[PDB]
């Protein structure tokens, strides 16, 4: 076997300027011909891989002419002249000189964007969960950047931990935004003790922490 390596593993790039991703091989990649075999795939979030470059110097049909490669032997380099909103994904490099053909670790490209104020919402449980055996309250975070944040649940002015989980989404390809949500689980027996519930949200772009709460007993 021969193992592929890339550098780096994550790369944040502002739209407009060129970028570069490197994939180094472990064995010489040059068959009895003058050709050197290589590939570069692009997997957008939620889709299937596509082909961009094969033979390391010839593009594929329909691909925009911004991508290109070069090098021979054990060194190759791919460059993107101008990144766009749809270039969010994970890139791989394949060798195909001999069986087996294995990929690399996968470079993650990150797109950059002016900071925007997050929006928050809270979801009180309805009667179906109130009778199904477990009550859940969900806090919603939408269209914020950067993803860096951290939330708490304040139940009757008491910190809670060890019984909540948060969900994150990959960056959207249309606006370059991150969305987050928080879930809390609790049984029926200890639920009939508290009155006020809230979720806490702190963001870099927010001047002050924002707290949204609700009181149990109103439809």
User: Which residues on adjacent β-strands are paired with residue 75?
Assistant: 24
Cβ distance to another protein smaller for residue 70 or 81: 70
Strand order through the sheet with 178-187: 119-123, 134-144, 178-187, 164-168
**Cβ pair 191, 147 in contact under 8 A:** no
Q: How far is the CB of 62 from another protein (least distance, A)?
A: 11
**Cβ pair 191, 135 in contact under 8 A:** yes
Q: How far is the CB of 208 from another protein (least distance, A)?
A: 16
Cβ distance to another protein smaller for residue 3 or 115: 3
**Cβ pair 92, 51 in contact under 8 A:** no
Cβ distance to another protein smaller for residue 42 or 83: 42
List Cα–Cα distances, 101 to 1, 39, 50, 93, in angstroms. 8, 11, 17, 10
Q: How far is the CB of 16 from another protein (least distance, A)?
A: 26
Report the distance separating Cα 21 and Cα 80, nearest Å: 9
**Cβ pair 188, 209 in contact under 8 A:** no
Q: Which two tokens stand for residue 110?
A: 């990150």
Q: How far is the CB of 114 from another protein (least distance, A)?
A: 21
Q: How far is the CB of 14 from another protein (least distance, A)?
A: 26
Chain residues that interact with another protein, rule: CB under 8 A: 5, 7, 24, 26, 30-37, 39, 41, 48-51, 54-57, 60, 70-75, 92, 94, 96-106, 119-124, 126, 128-129, 132, 136, 138, 140, 142, 165, 167-169, 179, 181, 183, 212, 214, 218-219
Cβ distance to another protein smaller for residue 136 or 202: 136
Cβ distance to another protein smaller for residue 37 or 152: 37
């Amino acid at each position: 076997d021969i193992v592929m390596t890339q550098s780096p593993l994550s790369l944040p790039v502002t739209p407009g300027e060129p970028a570069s991703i490197s994939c180094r091989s472990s064995q010489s990649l040059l068959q009895n011909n003058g050709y050197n075999y290589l590939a570069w795939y692009l997997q957008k979030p939620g889709q299937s891989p596509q082909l961009l470059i094969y033979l390391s110097s010839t593009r594929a049909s329909g691909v925009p002419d911004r991508f290109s490669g070069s090098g021979s032997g054990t060194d190759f380099t791919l460059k993107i002249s101008r990144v766009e909103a749809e270039d969010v994904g994970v890139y791989y490099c394949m060798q195909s000189l001999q069986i087996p053909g294995t990929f690399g670790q996968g470079t993650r490209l990150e797109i950059k964007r002016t900071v925007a104020a997050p929006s928050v919402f809270i979801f009180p449980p309805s009667d179906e969960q109130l009778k199904s055996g477990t009550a859940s309250v969900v806090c919603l975070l939408n269209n914020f950047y950067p993803r860096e944040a951290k939330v708490q649940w304040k139940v009757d002015n008491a910190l809670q931990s060890g019984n909540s989980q948060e969900s994150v989404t990959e960056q959207d390809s249309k606006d370059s935004t991150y969305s987050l949500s928080s879930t809390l689980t609790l049984s029926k027996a200890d639920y009939e003790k508290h009155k006020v519930y809230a979720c806490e949200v702190t963001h870099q772009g927010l001047s002050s922490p924002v707290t949204k709460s609700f009181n149990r007993g109103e439809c």
